[PDB]
Design a protein around this ligand. Structure first.
Ligand SMILES: CC1=C(/C=C/C(C)=C/C=C/C(C)=C/C=C/C=C(C)/C=C/C=C(C)/C=C/C2=C(C)C(=O)CCC2(C)C)C(C)(C)CCC1=O
Ligand SMILES: [Cl-]
Length: 312
């Protein structure tokens, strides 16, 4: 089953401090949630610059941003608290319809406006609650790759989803990289063509080729999230959330599994277009391939430390 395949390579130590820290953050008072992330954002910006949101994304968030910018200060603060509290409001429903990148670009803009004083800032001299100060301390002790994953997950969690098949807004799909200019990965130990083609197609934004590597019932499990099952949902996820990554796999190991299956573990690094080469996340991929080589299951794990990379 997909759910049992979740257990392959049980030695892999994932960075479960990330969902732990998100769960602590999610307990906090909404104003402290907003202050804490402001605090973390300012500090992090001393050494790491976030890439600008794409034009399409900004256009899609523009109405909502304008609405907030038109509010009085107290209402601005209430609107941001509504998003953090996951209140059911029109703003919260609009926000929930957005892909992660659009939500991130919305908050990018608000951060700039708060820095400039045009959107109500965190109150001057604000002191975090006892629980919130310790949450921030944990965040600031993590590796940058973990730090940025905590911030993304806090952003994505905000807002209010009412319904099963509500509208989904995402950025337009980029055209795949021309075949001529495509790079090929090299992985120590691993010549498996399905793994190599996985990595190379994702790096080229070639989602239609990538999806064809999977079994019809196959699943992909992103870090700290449940498996996404079947070709339509996995392709959806590629198109909405997996554009412009850079996968830098380094080494792997290849083992038999029950029934002519093969299990392969690869470790390496990943860069998100929000940070480019300044943040390299430590990642493992865990593949379960059927006898024909298609992908029945792949898990992508954020690793606890670089000491989890194979043969560090
Ligand atoms: C919120 C907020 C603010 C602002 C906050 C702001 C502006 C925060 C901005 C935060 C940003 C821009 C975070 C970006 C994170 C991106 C990550 C972790 C991507 C990981 C990708 C991975 C691992 C993908 C890997 C993958 C591989 C390898 C596969 O093989 C398959 C695909 C898959 C995707 C799984 C303010 C500052 C205004 C204060 C108030 C406040 O609350
Ligand atoms: Cl990303």
């Amino acid at each position: 089953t997909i759910d049992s395949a979740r257990g392959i390579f049980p030695n892999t130590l994932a960075a479960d401090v990330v969902p732990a820290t998100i769960a602590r953050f999610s307990q906090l008072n909404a104003e402290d949630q907003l202050a804490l992330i402001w605090f973390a954002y300012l500090e992090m910006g001393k050494t790491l610059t976030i890439a600008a949101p794409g034009a399409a994304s900004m256009q899609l968030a523009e109405n909502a941003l304008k609405e907030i910018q038109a509010m009085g200060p107290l209402q601005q603060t209430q609107a941001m608290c509504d998003l953090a509290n996951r209140a059911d409001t029109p703003l919260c429903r609009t926000y929930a319809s957005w892909s992660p990148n659009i939500k991130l670009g919305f908050w990018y803009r608000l951060g700039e406006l708060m820095e400039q004083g045009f959107v109500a800032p965190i109150p001057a001299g604000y002191q975090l609650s006892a629980n919130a100060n310790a949450v921030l301390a944990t965040i600031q002790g993590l590796e940058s790759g973990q730090q940025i994953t905590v911030l993304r997950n806090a952003v994505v969690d905000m807002g209010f989803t009412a319904g099963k098949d509500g509208k989904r807004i995402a950025e337009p799909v980029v055209p795949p990289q021309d075949t001529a200019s495509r790079t090929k990965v090299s992985i120590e130990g691993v010549t498996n063509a399905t793994v190599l083609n996985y990595m190379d197609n994702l790096n080229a934004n070639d989602f239609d080729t990538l999806i064809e590597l999977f079994t019809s019932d196959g699943a992909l499990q992103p870090p700290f999230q449940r498996p996404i099952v079947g070709k339509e949902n996995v392709l959806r996820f590629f198109r909405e959330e997996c554009q412009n990554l850079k996968l830098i796999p380094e080494r792997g190991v290849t083992e038999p599994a029950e029934d002519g299956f093969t299990q392969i573990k690869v470790t390496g690094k990943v860069q998100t277009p929000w940070f480019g080469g300044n943040v390299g996340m430590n990642i493992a991929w865990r593949f379960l391939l059927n006898p024909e080589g298609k992908i029945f299951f792949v898990a992508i794990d954020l690793l606890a430390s670089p000491k989890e990379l194979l043969n560090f």
